[PDB]
Amino acid sequence: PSTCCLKYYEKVLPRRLVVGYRKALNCHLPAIIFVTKRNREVCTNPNDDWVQEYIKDPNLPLLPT
Amino acid sequence: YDYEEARCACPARHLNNTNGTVLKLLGCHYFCNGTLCTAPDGYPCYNLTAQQVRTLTTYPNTSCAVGVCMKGTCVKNGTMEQCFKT
């Protein structure tokens, strides 16, 4: 799993923009990566409450790499 | 959506290693959506010579100088480990 995050997006990503997510926890900076409709990859803090809320949403899929 | 916050918040490819330690960036910079980004101070990195980079393979044969990013310079700490690409 060779791709890891170096900085967190510190604000709440609008949920409308999010297509799915990937986990990148086995990294120096563990992160949840959200992928947007514009196919941007956004690193986020797994400790933020909104991040955990999004990933537990059954409508929001885990994306294979 | 905040384009400034997101700009350098994309994942980057790291080099792997044979000894179980954290994955490290080649150098202290990475690309995100056409922006050149700088790793944060403290980030783990490898400081490779020009010829080490050119001959770096997927095969573990390069003895790679570990460092710590400081102001965008990979400051060697004296540790060596075998690193390779993916």
Author numbering:
A (entry chain B): 14 to 78
B (entry chain A): 15 to 100
Please quote the authors directly.
Evasins are chemokine-binding proteins from tick saliva, whose application as anti-inflammatory therapeutics will require manipulation of their chemokine target selectivity. The A3 evasin EVA-AAM1001 (EVA-A) bound to CC chemokines and inhibited their receptor activation. Structures of chemokine-bound EVA-A revealed a deep hydrophobic pocket, unique to A3 evasins, that interacts with the residue immediately following the CC motif of the chemokine.
To understand how class A3 evasins achieve chemokine binding and inhibition, we purified and crystallised complexes of EVA-A bound to human CCL7, CCL11, CCL16 and CCL17, and solved their structures at resolutions of 1.51–2.01 Å. All four structures display the same fold and 1:1 stoichiometry. In the EVA-A:chemokine structures, the side chain of the chemokine CC + 1 residue (Tyr in CCL7; Phe in CCL11, Leu in CCL16 and CCL17) sits in a deep hydrophobic pocket within the evasin structure, possibly enabling the ~35° rotation of the chemokine relative to its position in class A1 evasin complexes. To verify the contribution of the CC + 1 residue to affinity, we mutated this residue to Ala in CCL7, CCL11 and CCL16. Surprisingly, CCL16(L19A) exhibited only slightly reduced affinity for EVA-A. Thus, we conclude that the preference of EVA-A for CCL16 over CCL7 and CCL11 is because the aromatic residues in the latter two chemokines are energetically disfavoured, a phenomenon known as negative selection. Here, we found that the preference of EVA-A for chemokines with aliphatic CC + 1 residues results from negative selection against some chemokines with aromatic CC + 1 residues.
